[PDB]
Design a protein around this ligand. Structure first.
Ligand SMILES: [Cu+]
Length: 129
Protein backbone atom coordinates (compact mmCIF):
# COMPACT_ATOMS: atom_id res chain seq x y z
CA UNK A 1 0.00 0.00 0.00
CA UNK A 2 0.85 3.73 0.04
CA UNK A 3 1.28 6.65 2.54
CA UNK A 4 -1.34 8.92 0.88
CA UNK A 5 -4.74 8.55 -0.67
CA UNK A 6 -6.98 10.76 -2.74
CA UNK A 7 -10.73 10.70 -2.40
CA UNK A 8 -13.06 12.51 -4.81
CA UNK A 9 -16.44 13.75 -3.69
CA UNK A 10 -19.17 14.87 -6.07
CA UNK A 11 -22.57 16.50 -6.53
CA UNK A 12 -24.42 13.21 -6.02
CA UNK A 13 -23.28 12.78 -2.41
CA UNK A 14 -20.67 10.15 -3.26
CA UNK A 15 -17.07 9.34 -2.51
CA UNK A 16 -15.28 7.51 -5.34
CA UNK A 17 -13.29 5.22 -3.05
CA UNK A 18 -14.76 3.05 -0.30
CA UNK A 19 -11.61 1.63 1.26
CA UNK A 20 -8.25 3.10 2.17
CA UNK A 21 -5.32 1.02 3.30
CA UNK A 22 -2.51 2.66 5.22
CA UNK A 23 0.79 0.89 4.52
CA UNK A 24 2.55 -0.40 7.63
CA UNK A 25 5.70 1.34 6.46
CA UNK A 26 4.07 4.74 7.07
CA UNK A 27 4.76 7.01 10.05
CA UNK A 28 2.31 9.63 8.76
CA UNK A 29 -0.50 9.40 6.23
CA UNK A 30 -2.06 12.13 4.12
CA UNK A 31 -5.65 12.17 2.91
CA UNK A 32 -6.38 14.40 -0.07
CA UNK A 33 -10.03 15.38 -0.72
CA UNK A 34 -11.19 16.83 -4.02
CA UNK A 35 -14.70 18.20 -4.68
CA UNK A 36 -15.13 17.39 -8.36
CA UNK A 37 -18.64 18.79 -8.59
CA UNK A 38 -20.02 22.25 -9.27
CA UNK A 39 -22.20 22.81 -6.17
CA UNK A 40 -21.39 25.47 -3.60
CA UNK A 41 -20.56 24.61 0.01
CA UNK A 42 -23.87 26.00 1.22
CA UNK A 43 -25.66 23.26 -0.69
CA UNK A 44 -23.23 20.43 -0.95
CA UNK A 45 -20.00 20.97 0.87
CA UNK A 46 -17.86 17.95 1.68
CA UNK A 47 -15.13 17.04 4.13
CA UNK A 48 -13.34 13.91 5.23
CA UNK A 49 -13.45 13.02 8.94
CA UNK A 50 -11.59 9.97 10.34
CA UNK A 51 -12.78 8.24 13.50
CA UNK A 52 -13.15 4.84 15.01
CA UNK A 53 -16.09 3.28 13.19
CA UNK A 54 -18.12 3.18 16.42
CA UNK A 55 -17.82 6.99 16.80
CA UNK A 56 -19.04 8.00 13.32
CA UNK A 57 -22.63 8.92 14.12
CA UNK A 58 -21.78 10.71 17.37
CA UNK A 59 -19.05 12.75 15.72
CA UNK A 60 -21.30 13.61 12.75
CA UNK A 61 -24.08 14.72 15.14
CA UNK A 62 -21.78 16.90 17.23
CA UNK A 63 -20.32 18.16 13.96
CA UNK A 64 -23.73 19.41 12.68
CA UNK A 65 -24.01 21.42 15.90
CA UNK A 66 -20.52 22.88 15.41
CA UNK A 67 -21.48 24.56 12.15
CA UNK A 68 -19.88 25.23 8.80
CA UNK A 69 -17.30 27.69 10.16
CA UNK A 70 -15.94 24.81 12.30
CA UNK A 71 -15.87 22.53 9.22
CA UNK A 72 -18.84 20.69 10.77
CA UNK A 73 -16.52 19.15 13.37
CA UNK A 74 -16.74 19.98 17.05
CA UNK A 75 -13.69 21.94 18.11
CA UNK A 76 -11.26 19.73 20.10
CA UNK A 77 -13.31 16.53 19.52
CA UNK A 78 -11.07 13.83 20.95
CA UNK A 79 -12.77 11.17 18.83
CA UNK A 80 -11.52 12.76 15.60
CA UNK A 81 -8.22 11.36 14.40
CA UNK A 82 -8.04 13.83 11.53
CA UNK A 83 -10.32 15.93 9.38
CA UNK A 84 -10.21 18.22 6.37
CA UNK A 85 -11.94 21.54 5.90
CA UNK A 86 -15.36 21.62 4.26
CA UNK A 87 -14.87 22.37 0.57
CA UNK A 88 -17.16 23.22 -2.31
CA UNK A 89 -17.05 22.41 -5.97
CA UNK A 90 -13.71 23.01 -7.58
CA UNK A 91 -11.80 23.00 -4.30
CA UNK A 92 -9.46 20.54 -2.57
CA UNK A 93 -7.96 20.05 0.88
CA UNK A 94 -5.63 17.67 2.63
CA UNK A 95 -4.82 16.53 6.12
CA UNK A 96 -1.93 14.51 7.52
CA UNK A 97 -2.06 12.37 10.65
CA UNK A 98 0.18 10.18 12.76
CA UNK A 99 -0.27 6.48 11.94
CA UNK A 100 0.38 5.66 15.60
CA UNK A 101 -3.27 6.80 16.10
CA UNK A 102 -4.43 3.78 13.91
CA UNK A 103 -4.24 0.35 15.54
CA UNK A 104 -3.92 -2.90 13.63
CA UNK A 105 -7.15 -4.87 13.67
CA UNK A 106 -9.42 -1.89 14.44
CA UNK A 107 -12.15 -0.57 12.24
CA UNK A 108 -11.97 3.08 11.22
CA UNK A 109 -14.48 5.11 9.25
CA UNK A 110 -13.84 8.11 7.04
CA UNK A 111 -16.98 10.07 6.27
CA UNK A 112 -18.37 13.48 5.42
CA UNK A 113 -19.81 15.38 8.40
CA UNK A 114 -21.64 17.98 6.35
CA UNK A 115 -25.26 17.73 7.56
CA UNK A 116 -26.96 14.59 6.27
CA UNK A 117 -24.02 13.33 4.24
CA UNK A 118 -22.58 10.62 6.50
CA UNK A 119 -25.35 8.15 5.58
CA UNK A 120 -24.12 8.21 1.95
CA UNK A 121 -20.47 9.25 2.17
CA UNK A 122 -18.48 6.79 4.21
CA UNK A 123 -15.64 4.34 3.67
CA UNK A 124 -13.34 2.14 5.72
CA UNK A 125 -9.74 2.83 6.63
CA UNK A 126 -7.40 0.16 7.97
CA UNK A 127 -3.74 -0.40 8.65
CA UNK A 128 -2.26 -2.94 6.26
CA UNK A 129 -0.90 -6.39 7.06
CU1 LIG B 1 -20.44 15.87 2.08
Amino acid sequence: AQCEATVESNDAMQYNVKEIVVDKSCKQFTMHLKHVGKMAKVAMGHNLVLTKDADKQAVATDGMGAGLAQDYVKAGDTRVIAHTKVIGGGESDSVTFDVSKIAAGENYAYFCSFPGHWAMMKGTLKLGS
